[PDB]
Amino acid sequence: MNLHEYQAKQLFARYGLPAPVGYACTTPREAEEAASKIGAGPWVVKCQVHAGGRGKAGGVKVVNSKEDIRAFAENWLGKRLVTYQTDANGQPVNQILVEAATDIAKELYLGAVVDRSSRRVVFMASTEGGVEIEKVAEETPHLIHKVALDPLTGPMPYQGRELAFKLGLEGKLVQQFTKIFMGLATIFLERDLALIEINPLVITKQGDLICLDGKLGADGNALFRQPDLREMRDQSQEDPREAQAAQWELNYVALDGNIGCMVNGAGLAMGTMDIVKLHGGEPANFLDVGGGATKERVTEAFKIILSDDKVKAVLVNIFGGIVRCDLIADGIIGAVAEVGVNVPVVVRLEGNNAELGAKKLADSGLNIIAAKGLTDAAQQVVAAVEGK
Amino acid sequence: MNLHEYQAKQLFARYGLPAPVGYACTTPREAEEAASKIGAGPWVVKCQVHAGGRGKAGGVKVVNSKEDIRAFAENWLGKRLVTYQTDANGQPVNQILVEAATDIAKELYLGAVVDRSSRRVVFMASTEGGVEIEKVAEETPHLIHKVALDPLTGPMPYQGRELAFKLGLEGKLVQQFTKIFMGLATIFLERDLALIEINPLVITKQGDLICLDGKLGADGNALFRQPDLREMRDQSQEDPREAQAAQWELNYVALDGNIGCMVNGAGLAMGTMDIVKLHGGEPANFLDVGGGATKERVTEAFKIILSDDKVKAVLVNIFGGIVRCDLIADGIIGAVAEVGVNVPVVVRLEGNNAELGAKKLADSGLNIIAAKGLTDAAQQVVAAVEGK
Amino acid sequence: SILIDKNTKVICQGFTGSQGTFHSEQAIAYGTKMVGGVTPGKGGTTHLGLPVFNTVREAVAATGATASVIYVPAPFCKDSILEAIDAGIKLIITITEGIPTLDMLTVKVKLDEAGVRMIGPNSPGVITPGECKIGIQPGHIHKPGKVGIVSRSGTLTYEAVKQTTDYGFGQSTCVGIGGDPIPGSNFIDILEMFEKDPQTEAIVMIGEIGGSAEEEAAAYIKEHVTKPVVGYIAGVTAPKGKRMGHAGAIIAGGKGTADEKFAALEAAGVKTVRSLADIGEALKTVL
Amino acid sequence: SILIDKNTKVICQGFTGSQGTFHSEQAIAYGTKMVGGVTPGKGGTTHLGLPVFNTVREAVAATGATASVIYVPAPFCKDSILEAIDAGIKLIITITEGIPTLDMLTVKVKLDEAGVRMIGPNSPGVITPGECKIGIQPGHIHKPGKVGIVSRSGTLTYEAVKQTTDYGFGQSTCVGIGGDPIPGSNFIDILEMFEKDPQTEAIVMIGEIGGSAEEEAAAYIKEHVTKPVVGYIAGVTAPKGKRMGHAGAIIAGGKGTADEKFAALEAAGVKTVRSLADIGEALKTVL
Numbered sequence A, B: 001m002n003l004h005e006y007q008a009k010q011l012f013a014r015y016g017l018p019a020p021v022g023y024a025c026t027t028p029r030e031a032e033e034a035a036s037k038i039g040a041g042p043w044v045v046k047c048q049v050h051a052g053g054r055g056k057a058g059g060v061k062v063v064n065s066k067e068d069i070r071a072f073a074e075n076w077l078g079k080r081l082v083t084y085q086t087d088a089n090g091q092p093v094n095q096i097l098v099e100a101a102t103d104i105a106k107e108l109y110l111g112a113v114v115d116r117s118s119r120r121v122v123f124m125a126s127t128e129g130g131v132e133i134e135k136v137a138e139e140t141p142h143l144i145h146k147v148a149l150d151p152l153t154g155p156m157p158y159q160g161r162e163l164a165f166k167l168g169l170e171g172k173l174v175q176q177f178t179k180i181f182m183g184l185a186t187i188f189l190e191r192d193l194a195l196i197e198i199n200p201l202v203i204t205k206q207g208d209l210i211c212l213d214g215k216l217g218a219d220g221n222a223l224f225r226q227p228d229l230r231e232m233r234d235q236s237q238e239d240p241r242e243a244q245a246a247q248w249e250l251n252y253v254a255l256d257g258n259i260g261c262m263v264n265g266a267g268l269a270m271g272t273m274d275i276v277k278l279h280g281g282e283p284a285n286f287l288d289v290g291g292g293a294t295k296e297r298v299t300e301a302f303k304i305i306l307s308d309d310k311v312k313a314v315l316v317n318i319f320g321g322i323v324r325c326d327l328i329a330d331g332i333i334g335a336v337a338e339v340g341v342n343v344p345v346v347v348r349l350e351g352n353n354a355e356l357g358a359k360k361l362a363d364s365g366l367n368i369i370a371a372k373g374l375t376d377a378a379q380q381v382v383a384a385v386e387g388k
Numbered sequence C, D: 001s002i003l004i005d006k007n008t009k010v011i012c013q014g015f016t017g018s019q020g021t022f023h024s025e026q027a028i029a030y031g032t033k034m035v036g037g038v039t040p041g042k043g044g045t046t047h048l049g050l051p052v053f054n055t056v057r058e059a060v061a062a063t064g065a066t067a068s069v070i071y072v073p074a075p076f077c078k079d080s081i082l083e084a085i086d087a088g089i090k091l092i093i094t095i096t097e098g099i100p101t102l103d104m105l106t107v108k109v110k111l112d113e114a115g116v117r118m119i120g121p122n123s124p125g126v127i128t129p130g131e132c133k134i135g136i137q138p139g140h141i142h143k144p145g146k147v148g149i150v151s152r153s154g155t156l157t158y159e160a161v162k163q164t165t166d167y168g169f170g171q172s173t174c175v176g177i178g179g180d181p182i183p184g185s186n187f188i189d190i191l192e193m194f195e196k197d198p199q200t201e202a203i204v205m206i207g208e209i210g211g212s213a214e215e216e217a218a219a220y221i222k223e224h225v226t227k228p229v230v231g232y233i234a235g236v237t238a239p240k241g242k243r244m245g246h247a248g249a250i251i252a253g254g255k256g257t258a259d260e261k262f263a264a265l266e267a268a269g270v271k272t273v274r275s276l277a278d279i280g281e282a283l284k285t286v287l
């Protein structure tokens, strides 16, 4: 799960890492009042949304008057910010971070992720701050420096120094950088982060390192032991259907298309989406039933998939699971009736009572086709959205 | 460095481990007043000295009246407690720990040390609590259970459970034991301990685990990063000469004999002591000069070695070092004069200007013999204490 | 076959729990030599007619089991896995989903240093049709055969199982390496076992988006795998930077797309199939 | 000879510090191929005519050094040692005294897994007389020869050096494994190197109280060392449970006395000598 920039900075402060003086404000009045608590302008006002690219979307401004701060908060609070990293619906802005302006001398990049190839937390740094780090990796790989945290020893100062010297830092900036590495590495491990990105990690004109931005991602699998992080979840930043699906033990991810997909299995779900795509279809979503495709659960699945108006058909692909194919069919039938599923539904059942479940579907009289195999199921859902 | 039992228990409490309700008191008045803060007697009153065997020496009593607590504090405060683990001079009692009586159902042992053979922090537990753990290892090894902390993973609950089940604990005692293991293991690693011993780790009649005693030893090499532990050092518990020696970069350990030994090198010091012993002598001390045998340092060495009235001769064995043999001789000479060394001194110098240093010693006229080799040096110091 | 066979003695950690019970019943019905289970606190009892132990070491001393299947909730897995490694278990099949990536990061290092093989986590398990079933896969769709299957996905594996059983090829051993970002074993590890296994004549490798295990497996196959390999990668239509169900099904930093994996496999000579429904056909081709 | 020789290229960590400077001057005068040093913050300067680097990796890339001698204060050693291991250094000679036992516990595990050899800490160093000197030992008392010396003590080693030089045997290589409880290398590791070294004809093993490395070395010698070994253990008169200078010179739990070590060595066929002054005589005997 993602954290807001202001929350990332609070965490940094809690670990003695440096970030600008700032306040997260929920009302224009709070935002304007923060100006004086911060001091002499100008002030940086930033919409707090999980997505990046806020700057290019107008969500980050340097203003010099309390009236400008207020105008900005008024403009954004309760409005959705669309950036190149959100869908066209954007993310709601419920907090404006008002912080002190920072005199930037140089912009660096410092970040960390779990590198799956080397199976290590890898920190990476670059003199190329203020740029999409991927861009820099593409073009100037030789400018990206990395160190892998050794699980046996924990992060070591020499690794922080190594990056600091590759970045050509010198003097107090080396110790400051080392300190930042050790703290971010420590936070990474103690808080079970999946990702850290300080872009930019700034060298100020006054000669100090400061985290100008912060993007933290927590390992959701570890939230059971990160109570602080757990409370920081901002559900407004994501499609609310995902959390709805999750509390129903469904993994849902909204896509662009019009063919809803309800499948048990993440791999099967993606493969089903791909096969629908392969047969001229446009998957509207990823929905992995995982949990026992019970009647209640399948019903929720339909409710969630159908909350998207673009959905013109629903392909249900169930291979195995804990429920027998005929019980799954009874639930798909109950779901279609009780949800008032007004779209055609194509079902591919495999496992015990597969044909009997198919028969039950065919005999319900509801617009539910029991397909014969996967290719067939794909062609039929594809054909079922023709014209719609 | 060793901690007092009360300090060990404070640390345990700080880590959520269980210890009796108790107070460390420096005056009989405090000790008597602790009774009421603790509650209903009877109360356990324990002299706080680093050495064990306090029980058999009379330093641990279960009393049932405030007047008894006071009488006990009055008897011990400022008095030295001699146990089978101290020298005949004992250790000063400056604190009396007054704690609640504990209803003991069973006594167990839980402890940990750095095992040098397996190069791991090894925790060990036994149903044989209340006994010298060495005794149990000798006789009933099959009753001693061990687990080695994995440096890669840190202590794991299964290890705590493993010991708990080998101890035949069951039910809530298993979780409690596991919790105690995890906490003690954590303290061991975080505080850089060299040793933990809970003897006895008690199962109370009420069915709970409680640390009735606690013996913690800190790795002195790690005190630079254990500020809390550093402050807990009680210098009164050790021969004050050791700390004196240490601040002068000398490692001193008082022994029984009468031939003082001043050597540069721990190995050479022990070997020198052994050779003196081998030639009929009785080493009075271990004193490793280590630090540059300067005049000032050698002087301190003499002051420290000679503070023991039993010393009838001092063997100085210097092999190498940073100071030239003649400068060492000048310092031994200055030391002997300025300290008013009234005993014979035998010196064995090896290295640059060895013979010139010897000549300088022979020409000083002070009672300082420059020996020719080590065997000779030993025989001569041995011979120099004959009759004295 | 690889990893397990008719002689593999298996203990189950989390044996008395719902899934541990249910799936052990299935393994037991299949003929898997389950010899016992471990549930701290229930040692000395019997469950499914087998002894339950308080620790894996007691279980191993008592039964000689060399493999452990784990059905322990995520919060306790690292502990369970390290306990198994410590007790001498040589093969750990971890079914559990939700294990913190950092826990697996440490476990993977331990596994590799202790020389212990782990399949999973977040895995459907391992099955050598006709001989040994450890895991949650439905055993009736399998057929003792010659196709070795490795996959980051349970359900997709079943599809490949159905197909290879329907074309009569059958399966030598099916290995679900799981959908986590840091699995105990990767494609390369399993591919190497299939190459060295006489009974396996062809390999179906099933991957998906995220990480680079498939791309590395490709490079590995080109140079060290001589048997024919049919590949299928799910997620061509998955968005980037979004978890698609499996913790490991996420395209991080724009790297690890399905197309890149197909491409890397194709370039290594792997017979890739764009539709998961054509795995059997492609095997027929290369067989 | 073992460990080092005329061709060993050495860098010094803590190169610009007092001891690093002083002892590098000595190594340099002895002919040791010191090729550089590492002091974070002083990279790009020259000291003792050699390049100083900010990191060990820069130093290794620049000089090709395979050995590093460490003169870094105890608080930073673990970091220095892990940095050297990470930079590819294959031989680390750590002089530093005072390194927390727990730091060495972790370092020792890292050393063993990375296949990096470390002598020390709390060591006088290593010297192959006539070829290479790394450490603080006085080089003029040594003589290119046939006796390999391993010791937990610097000064005692010098005594053995004097004796073996005086009897004309000379030394192949002297290795101070150091006086810490968890050294990077123990007696067994060095003994094995001496047994396999043609130039070493006899071995002087010098131990002291504490731990059980000597007792294990005894068992090892009996079974795997064919060359003659002369042993000396200091501390017969040391009290129990008291640190005698070296952090590792402490008899813990009444185990590890000098007598037990003498006894264990004697029982393995090692020629033990009760007086440290008779090491040369005992070598003469077995030579």
Ligand SMILES: CC(C)(COP(=O)(O)OP(=O)(O)OC[C@H]1O[C@@H](n2cnc3c(N)ncnc32)[C@H](O)[C@@H]1OP(=O)(O)O)[C@@H](O)C(=O)NCCC(=O)NCCS
Residues within 6 Å of the ligand: C013, C014, C015, C016, C017, C018, C019, C020, C038, C039, C040, C070, C071, C072, C073, C074, C076, C079, C080, C095, C096, C097, C098, C122, C123, C124, C125, C136, C153, C154, C155
């Ligand atoms: C592991 C998983 C199956 C557990 O679910 P579950 O059986 O309902 O959990 P339960 O609580 O009923 O049982 C777990 C048992 O583990 C036990 N347990 C806990 N810690 C343990 C340990 N260290 N060692 C052994 N057993 C342990 C518990 O005692 C419990 O048994 P009990 O009920 O007898 O006390 C579930 O958490 C999961 O990960 N599911 C996803 C599986 C998957 O989707 N795989 C991918 C292929 S598509």
Ligand SMILES: CC(C)(COP(=O)(O)OP(=O)(O)OC[C@H]1O[C@@H](n2cnc3c(N)ncnc32)[C@H](O)[C@@H]1OP(=O)(O)O)[C@@H](O)C(=O)NCCC(=O)NCCS
Residues within 6 Å of the ligand: D013, D014, D015, D016, D017, D018, D019, D020, D038, D039, D040, D070, D071, D072, D073, D074, D076, D079, D080, D095, D096, D097, D098, D122, D123, D124, D125, D136, D153, D154, D155
């Ligand atoms: C290591 C030891 C010799 C250091 O003493 P020292 O040289 O006086 O210490 P100094 O502070 O002068 O020098 C240490 C240098 O290490 C450097 N240093 C610190 N951390 C470092 C690191 N990670 N990498 C490299 N160098 C580092 C410092 O920069 C300093 O050099 P500088 O003065 O140029 O800044 C001392 O702490 C010691 O352990 N002595 C006992 C040796 C012994 O008795 N051995 C046993 C055989 S009997």
